Each structure stands twice: as C-alpha cells, then as structure tokens.
Amino acid sequence: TSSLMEQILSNDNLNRAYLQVVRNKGAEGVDGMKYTELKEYLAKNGEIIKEQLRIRKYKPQPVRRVEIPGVRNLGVPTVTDRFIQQAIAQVLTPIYEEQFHDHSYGFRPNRCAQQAILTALDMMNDGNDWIVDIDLEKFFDTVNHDKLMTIIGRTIKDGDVISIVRKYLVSGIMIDDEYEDSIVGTPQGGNLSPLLANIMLNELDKEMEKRGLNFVRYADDCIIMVGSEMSANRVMRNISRFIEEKLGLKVNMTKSKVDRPRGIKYLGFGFYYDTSAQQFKAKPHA
Amino acid sequence: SLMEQILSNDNLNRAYLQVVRNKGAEGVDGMKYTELKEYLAKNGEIIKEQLRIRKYKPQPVRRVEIPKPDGGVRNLGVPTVTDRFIQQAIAQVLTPIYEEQFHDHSYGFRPNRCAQQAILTALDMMNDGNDWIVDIDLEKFFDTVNHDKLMTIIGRTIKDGDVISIVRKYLVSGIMIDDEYEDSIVGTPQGGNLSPLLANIMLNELDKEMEKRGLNFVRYADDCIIMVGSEMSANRVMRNISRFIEEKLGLKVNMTKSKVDRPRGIKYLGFGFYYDTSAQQFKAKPH
Numbered sequence: 001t002s003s004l005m006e007q008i009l010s011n012d013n014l015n016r017a018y019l020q021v022v023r024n025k026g027a028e029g030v031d032g033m034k035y036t037e038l039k040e041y042l043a044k045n046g047e048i049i050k051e052q053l054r055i056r057k058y059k060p061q062p063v064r065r066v067e068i069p070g071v072r073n074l075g076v077p078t079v080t081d082r083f084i085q086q087a088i089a090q091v092l093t094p095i096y097e098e099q100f101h102d103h104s105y106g107f108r109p110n111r112c113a114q115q116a117i118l119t120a121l122d123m124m125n126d127g128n129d130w131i132v133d134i135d136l137e138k139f140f141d142t143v144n145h146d147k148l149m150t151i152i153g154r155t156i157k158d159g160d161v162i163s164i165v166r167k168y169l170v171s172g173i174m175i176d177d178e179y180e181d182s183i184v185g186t187p188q189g190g191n192l193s194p195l196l197a198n199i200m201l202n203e204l205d206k207e208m209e210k211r212g213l214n215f216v217r218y219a220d221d222c223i224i225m226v227g228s229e230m231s232a233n234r235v236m237r238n239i240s241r242f243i244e245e246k247l248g249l250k251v252n253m254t255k256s257k258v259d260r261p262r263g264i265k266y267l268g269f270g271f272y273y274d275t276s277a278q279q280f281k282a283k284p285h286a
Numbered sequence: 287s288l289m290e291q292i293l294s295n296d297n298l299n300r301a302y303l304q305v306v307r308n309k310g311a312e313g314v315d316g317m318k319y320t321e322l323k324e325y326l327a328k329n330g331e332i333i334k335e336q337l338r339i340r341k342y343k344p345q346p347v348r349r350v351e352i353p354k355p356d357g358g359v360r361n362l363g364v365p366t367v368t369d370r371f372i373q374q375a376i377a378q379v380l381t382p383i384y385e386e387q388f389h390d391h392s393y394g395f396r397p398n399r400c401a402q403q404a405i406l407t408a409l410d411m412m413n414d415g416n417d418w419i420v421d422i423d424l425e426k427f428f429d430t431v432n433h434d435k436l437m438t439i440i441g442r443t444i445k446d447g448d449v450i451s452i453v454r455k456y457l458v459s460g461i462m463i464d465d466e467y468e469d470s471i472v473g474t475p476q477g478g479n480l481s482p483l484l485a486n487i488m489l490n491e492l493d494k495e496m497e498k499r500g501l502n503f504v505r506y507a508d509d510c511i512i513m514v515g516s517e518m519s520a521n522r523v524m525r526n527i528s529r530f531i532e533e534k535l536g537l538k539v540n541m542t543k544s545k546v547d548r549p550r551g552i553k554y555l556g557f558g559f560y561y562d563t564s565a566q567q568f569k570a571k572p573h
C-alpha cells in the first residue's frame with residue numbers, strides 16, 4: 001500500500017466513482033452544484049483536480065449543514081468532494097474488508113441491518129439474553145483525528161492518501177444515521193466517513209473478539225449478548241473503560257444500560273419472545 | 287447416491303443440531319425438540335432403512351395458532367421434530383445444488399439473504415427511473431400448487447427416485463411457508479426448512495422468464511414486484527407475467543390485490559416507500 005494514490009486517480013476508478021456518486025444523487029454542498037453538473041465539471045477540470053490531488057494542493061470544501069425531516073442534521077459535502085471521497089473508498093474498502101470482523105454490518109458491501117439482527121437473535125436464543133447496550137456519542141463529533149490517522153497508518157503507508165483523508169475529516173464528514181429509524185436507502189454524504197468509522201471501531205471488535213464476547217455492531221451502534229446479569233455489568237464496565245481509555249471515544253452513561261431483549265431498541269428493531277417458537281424474534285419498534 | 291448423501295453421518299448430525307437450534311413447537315406426536323436426541327439414538331437406523339426403501343411415512347403437520355406480537359394469531363403447519371429433522375437433512379444437500387441455479391434477485395429463505403436486500407435492490411431500480419411497479423399478488427403457494435407439476439420441475443434436476451419420493455410425501459404432509467416476514471418480523475421461521483426451498487424451485491421458473499424478458503424484479507418466496515419505466519409497459523408486464531404464472535406454473539394470481547402502482551402506494555415485505563426530497567430519491571421504512 002505504497003503507491004495507493006495512483007490507484008485512486010486511475011481512469012477506471014475515477015469513472016466508476018463518478019457514476020456511483022451521480023447514481024447516489026443527494027443534496028448539493030456549499031458550492032450549490034447539483035449532481036447533474038458533475039459530468040461537465042469533471043470533463044473540463046478533472047485533470048487539474050488530479051494534479052492538485054497528487055501534490056496535496058486540493059483543498060476540500062467544508063460540508064454544508066442541512067436540516068432534514070422532527071428534524072435531522074446532516075453534513076453534505078459538495079458533489080466534487082463526494083466524488084473524490086468515493087474514489088478513495090473504492091480503493092480502501094477491499095483492503096479493510098480483509099481485516100473487518102464478520103459481526104460488523106454497518107455500511108459494508110453486501111451487509112445490512114437485518115443481518116445484524118439475525119446474528120444477535122441467534123446469540124440470544126443460545127442463552128445469552130442479557131444485553132449490554134453501549135451508547136456512544138456521535139463518532140465524528142468526538143473522534144480524535146490524529147488517533148484515527150495513526151490507526152489507519154498501520155495499514156495505509158501512502159502519505160498522500162493519509163493527507164487527503166485527514167483533510168476530509170477536517171471538512172466535517174459524518175454518518176447519516178437514518179438506519180436508527182429502520183430506514184433503508186442510500187445515505188447522504190457517506191462515501192468515506194462510514195468506512196473511517198469502521199476502521200476505528202474495528203479496534204473495538206478485535207478487543208471484544210479477544211474476550212470471546214458475542215456481539216454485533218452497526219457503525220457506532222453495538223450490542224453485546226452475555227449469559228447473566230452480573231457478567232453483563234462486568235462487561236459493561238470493562239468495555240466502556242476500553243472505549244474511553246484506548247479509543248478516546250465517549251460512552252453516554254445516561255443512555256447505556258443492561259437489559260433484557262424486550263427493553264432493547266437496536267437499528268429501529270424491538271425484540272420479543274415468541275412463545276410458540278420458543279425463541280426471541282425481532283420487529284420494528286413504535 | 288443423493289439419498290445416501292442425505293443419510294450420511296455428517297449430514298444427519300448437522301441436521302439434528304440445526305433443528306434443535308431452531309427449537310419450535312411440537313408436531314402431532316407431541317414430541318419436543320429436547321427429546322429428538324434420545325428418539326434418534328433408538329430409531330435412527332430404523333428411519334434410515336425406511337427412507338432407503340421408501341417405507342418411511344411422514345406425519346401430517348399440526349395446525350398451530352401462533353400468537354402475533356401486535357395481537358391476533360397466525361395459523362401455521364408445524365411438522366413433528368422428527369420430520370423437521372429429516373426435512374433439514376434433505377434441504378442441506380439440495381440447497382447447494384439449487385443455489386447454483388437461483389437468480390441473484392431472489393432473496394426469500396436463502397443462505398446469507400434477507401428482506402432488506404430485496405428492498406435495497408428494488409430501491410436502486412426505482413431510482414434509476416423504473417418507478418412503475420407491477421405488484422402481483424399470488425394465492426398461498428402450498429394450497430394452490432399442483433404437486434405433479436412441482437415434482438416434475440424438481441425431477442428435471444433431481445434424478446434420485448428415493449429423494450423424489452420422500453419430497454412428494456412431505457408435500458402431502460402439508461408443509462408450508464411461515465409468512466411472518468410480511469409484518470417485518472425477523473427471526474427463525476417455523477414449519478420446517480424444506481417447504482421454502484420447494485417454493486423457490488417452482489418460482490425460479492418465473493425468475494428465468496422475467497430475466498429472459500429483461501425485466502427488473504426482486505422476489506422473496508412468492509412475493510415479487512417488478513420495476514418498469516412507464517405505466518403502459520407496467521400494464522403490459524402485468525398481463526404477460528400473470529398469464530405466464532397461471533398457464534405455465536399453474537399458480538393463481540389474486541386480481542383483486544394485484545395492481546400497477548407507483549412506489550409510495552406499494553407495501554412489500556412489511557416495508558413502505560417514500561420520497562426523500564433532500565436526497566432526491568425513494569427510500570423505504572416499515573409501514
């Protein structure tokens with residue numbers, strides 16, 4: 001992973017990134033450019049954009065704050081930035097798919113929220129029906145950028161890629177969290193930020209895997225299935241300590257709780273016990 | 287040798303563990319899932335012999351009232367834990383054979399597939415300009431399908447006469463599909479793991495026809511929607527596909543509940559569809 005930048009700027013990778021970003025549509029950024037205008041803009045300024053990226057002279061623009069229906073706050077990068085973030089992710093994704101845990105399902109190829117529910121249900125129905133529901137503050141509102149770049153540097157040795165990725169963290173990229181309402185569809189502004197959050201939280205997956213914990217994770221939304229109420233409280237304190245001390249994230253001790261499945265709301269699903277099947281099952285909550 | 291592959295020690299042991307893991311209600315014999323190991327330790331070789339000579343006779347399914355989480359009940363046919371054990375053993379060998387044939391846009395009761403993947407694929411089609419949906423509703427599969435027509439289509443792939451026999455006997459026993467996915471319920475279905483595979487084998491014929499016509503579709507068991515670009519082509523697809531389902535597959539289309547509509551009038555696998563103004567694209571959420 002030394003000359004990774006040239007793989008990102010290749011003709012085929014940029015063409016596929018441009019097609020995916022147009023297909024994803026989405027609102028406009030601070031420059032007001034619609035996704036229907038990216039084609040002619042790259043045809044006239046694409047080579048200059050590539051040259052600016054090689055010499056680390058491309059300056060990403062800040063994301064636009066958009067209120068979306070209550071209301072939801074999202075950070076929308078410009079369509080040019082979404083195009084570049086997609087070009088980076090297409091190269092970084094296959095590298096990190098070899099490291100990621102099988103029980104991580106958020107914003108990954110061929111993975112969705114229902115798979116996480118299914119795996120968690122199979123764990124509950126083996127006797128691990130005491131749920132540790134760790135609530136984290138907004139990832140990109142609390143992550144230390146240098147902490148994240150160091151973790152990325154263990155695998156990515158191309159400094160040009162490290163430099164441009166760091167700049168997009170500065171731009172304010174974040175995670176469209178509409179999955180919490182069981183919404184299915186294309187997220188906004190999430191070409192690169194979800195992958196970055198998975199690289200970070202993969203350190204939590206490896207720690208939980210080290211301790212033999214049964215868990216599923218979707219972005220920064222994780223639940224842990226354990227066999228007793230007391231070990232649940234021990235796992236609760238041990239993992240929350242690891243999240244704050246080793247990763248620098250903040251555990252919301254007001255929302256985090258230990259509970260039975262029927263008290264858990266995860267990825268928009270609730271949990272109930274099927275008396276006929278003699279198993280826990282899941283369905284959307286109110 | 288296909289029968290002997292189903293009756294091998296490795297296959298039957300995997301089938302026992304999976305059926306015990308699925309738990310479930312008792313069949314007509316009142317045997318609980320925790321009693322299958324002692325029963326197989328006694329009559330295991332006897333059942334294997336009866337299956338080799340086509341002498342084993344499955345028990346009829348038990349009509350169980352399954353309480354729904356939001357009130358009311360569903361009626362479901364539950365095979366005995368012995369028959370669920372044998373149905374799983376058969377399905378474990380037949381699944382790799384038919385996974386090679388199945389269309390990528392079929393998601394019902396398949397390994398590593400789920401309803402959300404069908405929704406995501408349908409969303410990508412709608413947002414590409416195919417926002418006219420053919421919503422064909424089928425009468426329940428296992429009280430309308432012709433057993434001979436189904437066994438013939440199965441026979442064109444499976445040539446083992448001992449496997450064709452026991453599969454047909456399980457059709458007569460009344461196996462059916464747990465349709466709780468229609469209420470967005472996620473979890474292990476009841477009623478054995480053989481009937482959904484049989485339904486997919488039948489409806490895979492429809493998948494190949496729709497693919498031959500270049501149609502955009504997703505299918506989950508017998509619940510299929512087709513994404514087309516215009517209203518007149520939607521009515522044309524509605525007429526042509528409905529005729530193919532009834533004439534070539536012998537299934538029955540519910541003309542009252544079938545319709546041509548736009549996404550926000552469609553309810554599919556417990557999901558509804560809405561338009562995200564800011565994202566400028568359709569999305570989905572539980573209805």
Ligand SMILES: [K+]
Nearest residue numbers: 134135221222
């Ligand atoms: K959580």
Ligand SMILES: [K+]
Nearest residue numbers: 421422509510
């Ligand atoms: K349908």
